[PDB]
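hiii so my PI (J.) wants the whole complex modelled not just the main chain, which honestly fair. so below is everything: seven entries, each one labled with what it is. i double checked the lines twice but i was tired so who knows lol
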Amino acid sequence: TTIVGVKFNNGVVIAADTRSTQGPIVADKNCAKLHRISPKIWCAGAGTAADTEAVTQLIGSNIELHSLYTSREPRVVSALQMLKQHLFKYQGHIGAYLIVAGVDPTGSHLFSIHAHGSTDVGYYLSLGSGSLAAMAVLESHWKQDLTKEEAIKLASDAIQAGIWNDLGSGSNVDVCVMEIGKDAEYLRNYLTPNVREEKQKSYKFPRGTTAVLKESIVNICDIQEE
Amino acid sequence: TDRYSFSLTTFSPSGKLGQIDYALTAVKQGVTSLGIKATNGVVIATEKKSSSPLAMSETLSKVSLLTPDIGAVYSGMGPDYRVLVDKSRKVAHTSYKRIYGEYPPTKLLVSEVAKIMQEATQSGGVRPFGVSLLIAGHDEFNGFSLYQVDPSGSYFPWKATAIGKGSVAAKTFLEKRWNDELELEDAIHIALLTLKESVEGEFNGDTIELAIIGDENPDLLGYTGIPTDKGPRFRKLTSQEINDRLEAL
Amino acid sequence: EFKKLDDKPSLVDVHLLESKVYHKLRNLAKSKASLTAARTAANSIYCPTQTVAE
Amino acid sequence: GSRRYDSRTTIFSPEGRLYQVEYALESISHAGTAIGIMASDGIVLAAERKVTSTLLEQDTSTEKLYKLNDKIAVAVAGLTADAEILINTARIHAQNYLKTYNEDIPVEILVRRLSDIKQGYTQHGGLRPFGVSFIYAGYDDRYGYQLYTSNPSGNYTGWKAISVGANTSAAQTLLQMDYKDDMKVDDAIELALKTLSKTTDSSALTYDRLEFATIRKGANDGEVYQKIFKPQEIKDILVKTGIT
Amino acid sequence: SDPSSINGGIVVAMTGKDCVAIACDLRLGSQSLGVSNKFEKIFHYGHVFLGITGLATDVTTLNEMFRYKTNLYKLKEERAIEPETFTQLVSSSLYERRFGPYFVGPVVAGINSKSGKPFIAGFDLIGCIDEAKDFIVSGTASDQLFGMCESLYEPNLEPEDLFETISQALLNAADRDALSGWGAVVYIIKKDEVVKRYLKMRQD
Amino acid sequence: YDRALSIFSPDGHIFQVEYALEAVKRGTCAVGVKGKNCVVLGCERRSTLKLQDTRITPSKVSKIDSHVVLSFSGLNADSRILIEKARVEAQSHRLTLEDPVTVEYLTRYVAGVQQRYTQSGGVRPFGVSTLIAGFDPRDDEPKLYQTEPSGIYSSWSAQTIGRNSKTVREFLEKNYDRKEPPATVEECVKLTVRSLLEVVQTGAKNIEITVVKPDSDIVALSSEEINQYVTQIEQEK
Amino acid sequence: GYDRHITIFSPEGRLYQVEYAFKATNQTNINSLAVRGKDCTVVISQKKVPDKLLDPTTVSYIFCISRTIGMVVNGPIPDARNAALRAKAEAAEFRYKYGYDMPCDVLAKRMANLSQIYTQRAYMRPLGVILTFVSVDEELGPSIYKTDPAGYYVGYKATATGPKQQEITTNLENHFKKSKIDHINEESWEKVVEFAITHMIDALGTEFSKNDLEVGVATKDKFFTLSAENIEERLVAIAEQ
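here's the output for the full assembly
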């Protein structure tokens, strides 16, 4: 995957794709990799899938406790800090690449983190494999301060250029628009560029086209009755 | 040096563990709280009190959220609940939200907090928490449940129960007022009316703390466009809302 | 028949009505007696309020 | 300092006898009756709760009956709080045996392990022992059905029929007259209920205050089915045996 | 060379509609020698079925590990484990050994028995939760399977049809795989009954 | 924890060791008598009680080694801890030195378990005394030792511990000679039955006899065997 | 026996050891008065120094635990210092791990929880100090949270502490009864100091000096204290009211 984040005045949008890879092998057609640190703090994961998911889950617990002690919504910066330290004590052994986006009563923010513990600021941040491709689209057509109507289109177009010029990205574009004063709208499958075209045959066969040596019932659907 | 490892809680020659009996006295000195299980929600309620008129009771919580679907309420000592609520949230995460990725069942959570009680009556330097907790909740495998956590280190499920100084009278109130089918709306009206007799001061919605583990609220979900997830089943009622239910008595 | 099945707020009312009938028959020995029966079956003050008023 | 507030809790008396264990046996006599009867086709565990109320939900409660493993369940008589620790230790230990030998734990091994913990607490640390007595129903291949009682000192003794908790003497004496080795699980169910009706801890014995569980080899292919009966399935058997 | 490809073997899992089916081969050897055709790879807990591929030591050590945990759930809750909480549990316990990682690919296959809903998930190494509801493929000949699997499959099947597809996918992958071709088992997993069907397979 | 549960007394004693010995007095009686070709440990069982299955009930004699048996008097909770530690130690000797343990080695080992908690604080001593008996490998010499919770051990030609140990011991002064043990296995067995029939009585139900014969031959003589021996002694007397 | 000598429960269910802690915070005879302004929180406290040979400048009871959050202590000064040290350490820690400075609410709760732990332990003595935490937070406005030796705390409109604090309560109660709001409607922080001094004179009957007062003011996003020169400007300004 690739992650775009667009900070603008009204909120922040975060967009990433659903194509799962395990090496040049495509493991999954669909599998979302947008994770929730908090209800209002959505991140998405790139790099290794298991290193993103495993630490959003873990700090996901910590930030929830933190929220229950303050009895107020968590800050965005809190999430970044929790991650920074955790990555640093392994010395960048963990391969989490997260873009942390969020609304909270302080306002919209957008940050990124790299595996080693580096944290960057921005109004447009991009990361992952199709970073390079997503960035290109962005810098011509962008101006500072945009609406969500303008931005969701813009975000989305950039993830496309990750599909058609990078192979590490692909399939459907999923988007979470976290607005000020509203709950965050996870608009999953905003764009489906491509589906699998329907073939001309069914490969449904009568019984016996498979060779069978015996059969026997084995049940666990009961624990044995008297 | 330290040599406190001799248990403070020990058997007496007439049987019983003496220290927890002492601690149970403190529960019947505390505020009164009650919980009625409806067939369409649970209501838990307690009374807010203050030692100063310049104290704010909107900065005072005695019903707290452990997980979005399981709330707790105490009677007993203020300090002892204050520490133990944090530990309840913490063990709910370590033992089911990092292992099974979700909030624990109501049965599971109650058991774990009873172990924390148990080991605060084991070994020296630790005396029990002098609270009894009603832990009402909802899980998806056994529906609504209402529990009562003892300072003993045991629990009991109930159909409706009360704890605190006015518990004995309050449970006799609920005995005629409980039935096989109940509504959550009428459960609230019973709970307030019973707690009227256990409050000696004001009876406003600002001084009566009410919370339901009713049904999900998708405006407290914090996100939309996932229909799979259901919002917080718990919902603490603001003072104005409680005043409406006082007029509905 | 429902002496066996007496715990009901509905069967308090039976005893009250019985009092109201012995009243109008002008004997207040058995009205009193059946007031006293109603009282036992509402040892409770948690029987419906309308009943209590009666 | 530290030694000031200690009284030397766990020590011998001039008789040789451990104060806390003597005290512990008193507190188990407070707790309700639990009876175990070993039939030649199962083990019946039947316990009368120490709490009952019309507001107490007893229809989901399994406060005395707990399964340690698939072939070994216990009935509890003593402190429920104290028992909870040993119950989860037992689950860990049985699973540990299964992990390492890929064979189900015999009843002897599991009971011995728990017993060692209870002895250990009076031996060192100044800890109070667990004031509980358990009756273990268990199946194993080697000795078949095995019945065991454990006491709070940390010692286990085999039996054929035995009672712990409240009314141990009264229950035992009735069992001596009625027990036979030709009894089946059917006969043992009837005996258990009758004994509890004569050793009742109030003035009534009811289904809703009865917890009841068997372990029966009447499940097909010589397999053992642990069944913990619901109170309305207890109610069915309550009319069968003519208690009601 | 890598621990996973020394002991190899393949597992396919496919959803039906109101059924699922998981299949594996019984071949398990070291290097080129096939040892046994007496070890199956598929285990089960309540109604969830687990096939697990990769390094043999860690197959059998995680067999016991999974078993241990789902014993704790069964006795504690007094209800069986759901296929979706078996997934998180599988993931967590892989990622505890982050360092010296496990060298397997667990495949979770079951039917959530409280919606009748079919459920499959995949895994490799330390975690990574693979959501599909078509098919999940695993093992060293995961590439042979992935090809076969997409082409044959059609959304929604009856159990009777599901036996032909999932078998056919295992059949041609296993004998174009060096480390499979001795034995095979296919479990057709209904929520009313489980029929286990041994396959005849040509010698590899 | 290290707060004394064993502390020196102005009597030159520790109170708990004295108490420990009274705990063994209240225990059941174990008798040990060794022949010229056997050791015999017969012990009182509390199997008088009805509704008891004795198959699954612990025995009062537990083998620690192939040729080393251990009997005990005092608390039954305490004794099992000694029996488990003793066994682990026995297999360790086979691991690093080879050969099974000698009887003398085990006698010293159990004694050293009692010893440790007598001196240290935060621990009480056990209330359990043992009769450790057996053979050494490639030896037909019977060994009969007694260890006690003091941390002392002593060898004996014959000995008895538990309840009414004085009474049994007095009987053994006339029925056992230091110069001449029982010549045969059978006369040793019947002498141990005869000693038990003083205090224990009450059939062969509560009477147990374990015989160990040279180099790892352990046979336990069932109640039926004991009944025959009892009847012969009764008739003769 | 030891139900009053350590922190174990009594037959009464009341911890006597804990009660004794509150019976030592009023024996230092320091009164405090803390009011919430419309943009500030002001706390004034006694600073009675009866000696020529004690330097009055170093006699203090207002310790800055954060740059924005002051803390005023009523009760013994050894326990004050320990509670200040611990609070400062935690406030710093909160910045470090959560990326923003510790709120007044949570700093109060954290000391509250440690107080419970100190009365859980039977060899640890609780810190016998009543701590008032004054701030202006941006998510809670002008705030007062007052923790006590047991481990109980709550928010406040206004609060007082000391032996004579009942008199202070009377003044505050009238003020917020008439205004019908939980704070003083005064938009200059200096005049909230002037008001506070007036009610201190009313309550205790004592005429104050600049060397009997010590004033802490939390405005928005900073905490400062007035020096005795600045406090004298306020005392002159009472005459100009």
